From a paper:
To gain further insight into the reaction mechanism, we determined the structure of atATC in complex with the transition-state analog at 1.6 Å resolution. Surprisingly, the structure showed the atATC trimer with PALA bound to only one of the subunits. This subunit undergoes a 10° hinge closure of the N- and C-domains and a 24° rigid body rotation of the Asp-loop, emulating the movement needed to bring CP and Asp in close contact to favor the reaction. In contrast, the other two subunits exhibit an open conformation, similar to the apo or UMP-bound states, and have the active sites empty or with two sulfate ions and one glycerol molecule from the crystallization solution. Only the CP-loop interacting with PALA is well-defined in the electron density map, whereas the other CP-loops are flexibly disordered. The phosphonate group of PALA binds to the N-end of helix H2 (N-domain) and the O atom of the carbamate moiety interacts with T137, R187, and H215 (N-domain), whereas the N atom binds to L350 (C-domain). Also, the α-carboxylate group binds to R248 (C-domain) and the β-carboxylate binds to R310 and Q312 (Asp-loop). In addition, the CP-loop from the adjacent subunit binds through S163 to the phosphonate moiety, and places K166 at interacting distance of the phosphonate and the α- and β-carboxylates. Isothermal titration calorimetry (ITC) analyses confirmed that PALA binds to only one site per trimer (KDPALA = 0.6 µM) and somehow blocks the entrance of subsequent PALA molecules to the other sites. In turn, upon PALA binding, the CP-loop rearranges into two short and nearly perpendicular 310 α-helices, placing S163 and K166 to interact with the transition-state analog and moving A164, A165, and S162 outwards the active site.
However, much remains unknown in plants about the unique organization, regulation, and localization of the enzymes required for de novo biosynthesis of pyrimidines, which are potential targets for crop improvement and weed control. This metabolic pathway starts in the chloroplast, where aspartate transcarbamoylase (ATC) catalyzes the condensation of carbamoyl aspartate from aspartate (Asp) and carbamoyl phosphate (CP)1,3. In general, ATCs consist of a catalytic homotrimer with three active sites in between the subunits that can be allosterically regulated by association with other proteins. Each subunit folds into two subdomains of similar size: an N-domain (aa 82–221 and 374–390) occupying the center of the trimer and holding the binding site for CP, and a C-domain (aa 222–373) bearing the Asp binding site.
Numbering used by the authors:
A (entry chain A): 71 to 77, 80 to 160, 166 to 390
B (entry chain C): 80 to 160, 167 to 390
C (entry chain B): 79 to 390
The structure:
């Protein structure tokens, strides 16, 4: 047990939550994801994960998320046991995990209830990847978001990112803010109506981490100063019975051609998806519309994590 | 050289010479499928199946075809699970090399092809078209009757909503001296867009309500299911359209010895079970042929001629 | 090398003692394959179609994993009732006849008993019954017997308690049926009175050389058995009498106190899923064998796929 360094397993046994990652780990995972890009663009079929089986358990169905993981597995030469609709007499999640783990080498689970992923990881003796834990953690979304910024902008230190939309309740913007705080000289703009502003826990965490942040309800002003505009929807229900606030916000938190008109030439638009009319279809025609390149980057990040969890470094 | 089509969406995309060449490739794919050795033609390629409506033959034949050629498959049997179709397609194309989609809306497959930079195959777009059914149907006719020029074909059943017979009519129009009979309840007669296309193409067609007479004169009797899911809330019209045109032993008794019965499947009551024993009952051979035709299309779209 | 004597795996009565023992030996070979670092290619080139008219993630994945661990491939239908063309009204026979055009073996779980026999008669390729509504589930019975052999070390001379709804339980009836092919077996029947084991099984056991005993005292029985085989009380079997379901439900529980009276090397089995009839505490005991049991289903199902497609 004395062998060290080159004389190796991934330090994570499961991928469950953002707080598992530090800056050095992110940088190394992103290095692996760049290698996975090279593999996926090659004409030659990879055999890195030949002989390994992934079981997907989508209790909350997600065609996009599931296919990204299943594609990642097959692009590496692994195979897949698919369950696109795992929601179905007496079965705890723990009993399903303890059965399915006998049939597979890795489990990818998306659930509709927060807390499921931690329970599955604690139960399983094979690696678990959380593919979305109800409205809670979605760690590979956060990883692919940061990777996309690094790819598109060329750096993570010193950038300005606008987080737009349902900041109070949105796991994607909260988790992205959490990981960005691991880099240096980051400035975050929180753009939203007051009723869905970012909660104090993330604000206090950013301040404690030395991250500059600013709240604004003026998307046109913020977007002109940012490298990244990261958009999410504010659903009508989040205004509750306050129709006056819904009407005051109408048309004010949309990414449209006019917004792109004030943005820098090398800035980007991101969106974790699914996207509705909070990004207009016209925006898609702009090279700065990065949300489908972002989704593609999920393939490379998920390839990297499957490789690391199954065969290590 | 590369395949002249970038997508397989509409029956009108195919010309006569292309059809004959595809049929040759299908016969080569039958040799692969019967062989003991595992093909690697499509090694490294991934197909995404996106099925928004139920399917047995179309989805499984495409998936089997891909695997028999050495490619692999990402399956979605329940894609209705919202975002636009264009968002779904631009996402899924990042994960795959070809998309096979059955959608519930007519026109969806052409929208998908216009958005995607990888080949799209229309596995059925609402009551619109079903081009690979039409391809395997014409391949089956050629295989069973030995000719396409000069044949007489009866299209029977729910023609209005039948994406199968709509695409098949487009392909039959590429051959010479074809006669098509339309036999249906009035409720579900063939739509005017198909009628107008055949008339403009110079294809002789005739509506009749006398299936015994029509069947006695045809090389092919192509029966269809009354398309319940397309009737919406008009379940009155659905039940009224059923039971009027049945392929049974008495109908086979007036048909020529060299004629065939086809059906894209599934059938409910409209072909009786005792027809299956007749050598002219071709609908299970027809379904098997879809494997070879879909192998041919995957090969052509991904690696060319 | 020779052909497997079965063309399909449909029902327990297809199996005799010699066949069971031979399949269990193959299953041990499959365990060695599954533990190996090398991908098997025994079933390279073969295709399985799964047709789960009654969705069952655990059962379906066990079969699909078995196929892929042997190097074969799979055409999946997770919910054939809703997403195959059965949803358009297609008969089972037409579905099976069609699907064999794309595949080499069909694994089907249906909601209606009699479906598996119909599929086998229609198909000219092997069919495996993965659960025939309330009827036969033959690979569950096979993996159950295999698990006993593996955990206890023998099948001759064992004592097994079958606990739960014995009257209608396909798993306990089918397990009793196969255990009777071995020698000097004793079976204890523990159940609420309303769902006692029916006379057809009792008479078969008596005439097959199996001693059996009814008891309502699980604590007494469990101290004398190699195997306590627990099942879930199912609401549907009580019709329009929820009150009778609730009365039956909590009467026979495998809990820490029951484990405390069991023998040192006895085991607890359960076909799954379970509700509360095995308490969570029990999972911590090495004698809790129901997850090893589920894993053994992989090896048994690998063995059957191999035998049906490439023989002995
Ligand atoms: O459904 C029909 O009746 C005809 C046609 N049938 C098929 O394509 C066969 P399947 O639905 O099994 O793929 C269709 O339009 O979907």
């Amino acid at each position: 047990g004395l062998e060290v360094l080159f004389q190796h397993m991934f330090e994570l046994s499961d991928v469950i939550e953002g707080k598992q990652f530090d800056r050095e780990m992110l940088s190394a995972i992103f290095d692996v994801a760049r290698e996975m890009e090279k593999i996926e663009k090659s004409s030659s079929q990879s055999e890195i994960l030949k002989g390994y089986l992934m079981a997907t358990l989508f209790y909350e169905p997600s065609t996009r998320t599931r296919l990204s993981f299943e594609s990642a597995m097959k692009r590496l030469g692994g195979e897949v046991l698919t369950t696109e609709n795992a929601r179905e007499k007496g079965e705890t999640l723990e009993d399903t995990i303890r059965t399915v783990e006998g049939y597979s080498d890795i489990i990818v689970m998306r659930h509709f209830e927060s807390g499921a992923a931690r329970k599955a990881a604690a139960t399983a003796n094979i690696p678990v990847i959380n593919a979305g834990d109800g409205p809670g953690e979605h760690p590979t979304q956060a990883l692919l978001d940061v990777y996309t910024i690094q790819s598109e902008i060329g750096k993570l230190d010193g950038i300005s990112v606008a987080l737009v939309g349902d900041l109070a309740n949105g796991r994607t913007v909260r988790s992205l803010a959490y990981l960005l705080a691991k880099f240096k000289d980051v400035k975050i703009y929180f753009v939203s109506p007051e009723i869905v502003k970012m909660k104090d826990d993330i604000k206090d965490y950013l301040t404690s981490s030395g991250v500059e942040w600013e709240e604004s309800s003026d998307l046109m002003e913020v977007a002109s100063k940012c490298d990244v505009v990261y958009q999410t929807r504010i659903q009508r229900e989040r205004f509750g019975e306050r129709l006056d606030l819904y009407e005051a916000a109408r048309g004010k938190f949309i990414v449209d051609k006019d917004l792109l008109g004030v943005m820098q030439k090398k800035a980007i638009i991101m969106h974790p998806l699914p996207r509705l009319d909070e990004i207009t279809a016209d925006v898609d025609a702009d090279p700065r519309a990065a949300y489908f390149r972002q989704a593609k980057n999920g393939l490379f990040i998920r390839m990297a994590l499957l490789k690391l969890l199954l065969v290590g470094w």
